[PDB]
Design an enzyme around this catalytic site. Structure first.
Site, PDB file in Angstrom:
ATOM      1  N   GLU A 182      41.894 -18.079  12.364  1.00 48.13           N
ATOM      2  CA  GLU A 182      40.627 -18.764  12.328  1.00 48.13           C
ATOM      3  C   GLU A 182      40.094 -18.996  10.667  1.00 48.13           C
ATOM      4  O   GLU A 182      40.948 -19.491   9.918  1.00 48.13           O
ATOM      5  CB  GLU A 182      39.529 -18.139  13.230  1.00 48.13           C
ATOM      6  CG  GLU A 182      40.049 -18.284  14.692  1.00 48.13           C
ATOM      7  CD  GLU A 182      41.187 -17.119  15.096  1.00 48.13           C
ATOM      8  OE1 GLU A 182      41.035 -16.204  14.750  1.00 48.13           O
ATOM      9  OE2 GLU A 182      41.589 -17.554  16.149  1.00 48.13           O
ATOM     10  N   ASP A 220      36.439  -5.244  -0.500  1.00 46.43           N
ATOM     11  CA  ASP A 220      36.588  -4.973   1.002  1.00 46.43           C
ATOM     12  C   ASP A 220      37.657  -4.713   1.368  1.00 46.43           C
ATOM     13  O   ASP A 220      38.517  -5.183   2.047  1.00 46.43           O
ATOM     14  CB  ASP A 220      36.061  -6.477   1.540  1.00 46.43           C
ATOM     15  CG  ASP A 220      35.630  -6.298   3.180  1.00 46.43           C
ATOM     16  OD1 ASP A 220      35.481  -5.047   3.753  1.00 46.43           O
ATOM     17  OD2 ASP A 220      35.637  -7.309   3.867  1.00 46.43           O
ATOM     18  N   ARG A 247      42.253  -5.167   8.092  1.00 48.79           N
ATOM     19  CA  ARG A 247      42.192  -6.526   8.398  1.00 48.79           C
ATOM     20  C   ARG A 247      42.598  -7.456   6.988  1.00 48.79           C
ATOM     21  O   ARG A 247      43.050  -8.457   7.246  1.00 48.79           O
ATOM     22  CB  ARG A 247      40.600  -6.980   8.619  1.00 48.79           C
ATOM     23  CG  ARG A 247      40.350  -8.339   8.628  1.00 48.79           C
ATOM     24  CD  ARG A 247      39.050  -8.557   8.185  1.00 48.79           C
ATOM     25  NE  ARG A 247      38.254  -9.865   8.324  1.00 48.79           N
ATOM     26  CZ  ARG A 247      37.711 -10.371   9.518  1.00 48.79           C
ATOM     27  NH1 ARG A 247      37.626  -9.533  10.511  1.00 48.79           N
ATOM     28  NH2 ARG A 247      37.123 -11.548   9.561  1.00 48.79           N
ATOM     29  N   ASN A 248      42.452  -6.602   6.028  1.00 54.40           N
ATOM     30  CA  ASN A 248      42.676  -7.429   4.589  1.00 54.40           C
ATOM     31  C   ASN A 248      44.191  -7.031   4.162  1.00 54.40           C
ATOM     32  O   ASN A 248      44.436  -7.274   2.908  1.00 54.40           O
ATOM     33  CB  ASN A 248      41.515  -7.435   3.665  1.00 54.40           C
ATOM     34  CG  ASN A 248      40.056  -7.797   3.948  1.00 54.40           C
ATOM     35  OD1 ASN A 248      39.117  -7.128   3.779  1.00 54.40           O
ATOM     36  ND2 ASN A 248      40.105  -9.123   4.481  1.00 54.40           N
ATOM     37  N   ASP A 273      43.018 -11.093  -0.180  1.00 52.68           N
ATOM     38  CA  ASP A 273      41.447 -11.386  -0.276  1.00 52.68           C
ATOM     39  C   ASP A 273      41.076 -10.419  -1.466  1.00 52.68           C
ATOM     40  O   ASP A 273      39.959  -9.815  -1.305  1.00 52.68           O
ATOM     41  CB  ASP A 273      40.748 -11.025   0.889  1.00 52.68           C
ATOM     42  CG  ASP A 273      39.814 -12.398   1.912  1.00 52.68           C
ATOM     43  OD1 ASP A 273      40.285 -13.487   1.602  1.00 52.68           O
ATOM     44  OD2 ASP A 273      38.664 -11.842   1.868  1.00 52.68           O
TER      45      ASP A 273
END
Ligand SMILES: *CCC(=O)N1C[C@@H](n2nc(C#Cc3cc4ncn(C5CC5)c4cc3Cl)c(C(N)=O)c2NC)C[C@@H]1COC
Length: 279
Positions: A23, A148, A152-153, A166
């Protein structure tokens, strides 16, 4: 119109855009094929990830993507980071080419392998942590603070290489994007907006907990309003089930309230390499 950096410019005839990847975790990103990216195979189409602008993007959105590409060039290449491969800047929309990670983010990679044939071994989990620490050691040496760091990253390639994503981007607490980023923030980053390489070390400790819970979410069942109180009181997450004492002590060292008392990414690489050597 953008200035051209010839050494990074890829001909538009060499790129075929494909399907959207996920997404908007990392912006408008699509899967794509680039002919000639691999130097040894001039005719081979290589699957790459392309970051681009939306059809109604603002001048700010364009400058953001350009600055992201320029920061990628400045940081340089490393095996455990998602690398810049090229760009299409002239005669059409801006396309920034990045390494493709076939097995998605680390969180989903781990959650999918909780059972069966591909169930990850203890050594495989320590190897995942070691690779993330190595990529973070490189980014800290290049004066880059992620801000961050989370499962997920981190992206996983077809050959199971961990790649931090990221990192070169430019940067409320009760809101969610399917995730609560506050659960990875160091107290000084959360309460004072202070970001350093040592605040990323705290986030790495939370990422280690994610690895040894096989993609579990941090602080289960704790609302964010109660998390603020609990961290000031000195409370930390319990040892993940089946995790060793030495690895939990590394997580606890990452979560020292005093930032200088936390280890550096160089020290974490040495600690995790020692765990891999023994067990
Ligand atoms: C919401 C989607 C989701 O859960 N996904 C998306 C899927 N995915 N994302 C990436 C990527 C990327 C990437 C990373 C960056 N870090 C910085 N920058 C800017 C240049 C400075 C970027 C740009 C991009 Cl495009 C990929 C990939 N690279 O292959 C993938 N592959 C599947 C992961 C995850 C799905 O997990 C199951």
């Amino acid at each position: 119109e953008l200035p051209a950096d010839p050494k990074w410019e890829l001909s538009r005839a060499r790129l075929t855009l494909g399907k959207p990847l996920g997404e908007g975790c990392f912006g408008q990103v699509v899967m794509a094929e680039a002919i000639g990216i691999d130097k040894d195979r001039a005719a081979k189409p290589v699957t790459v990830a392309v970051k681009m602008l939306k059809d109604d993007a603002t001048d700010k959105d364009l400058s953001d993507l350009v600055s992201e590409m320029e920061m990628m060039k400045m940081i340089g290449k490393h095996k455990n980071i998602i690398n810049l491969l090229g760009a299409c800047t002239q005669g059409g929309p801006l396309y920034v080419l990045m390494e493709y990670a076939a097995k998605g983010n680390l969180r989903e990679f781990l959650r999918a392998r909780r059972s069966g044939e591909e169930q990850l071994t203890f050594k495989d989990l320590v190897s995942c942590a070691y690779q993330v620490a190595r990529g973070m050691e490189y980014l800290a040496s290049q004066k880059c603070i992620h801000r961050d760091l989370a499962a997920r990253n981190v992206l996983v390639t077809e050959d199971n290489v961990m790649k931090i994503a990221d990192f070169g981007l430019a940067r409320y607490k009760k809101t969610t994007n399917g995730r609560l980023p506050v659960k990875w923030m160091a107290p000084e980053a959360l309460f004072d907006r202070v970001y350093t390489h040592q605040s990323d070390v705290w986030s790495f400790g939370v990422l280690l907990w994610e690895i040894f819970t096989l993609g579990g979410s941090p602080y289960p069942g704790i609302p964010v309003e109660e998390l603020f109180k609990l961290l000031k009181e000195g409370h930390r997450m319990d040892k993940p089930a089946n995790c060793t004492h030495d690895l939990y002590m590394i997580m606890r060292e990452c979560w020292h309230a005093a930032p200088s008392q936390r280890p550096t990414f160089k020290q974490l690489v040495e600690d995790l390499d020692r765990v891999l050597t023994v067990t």
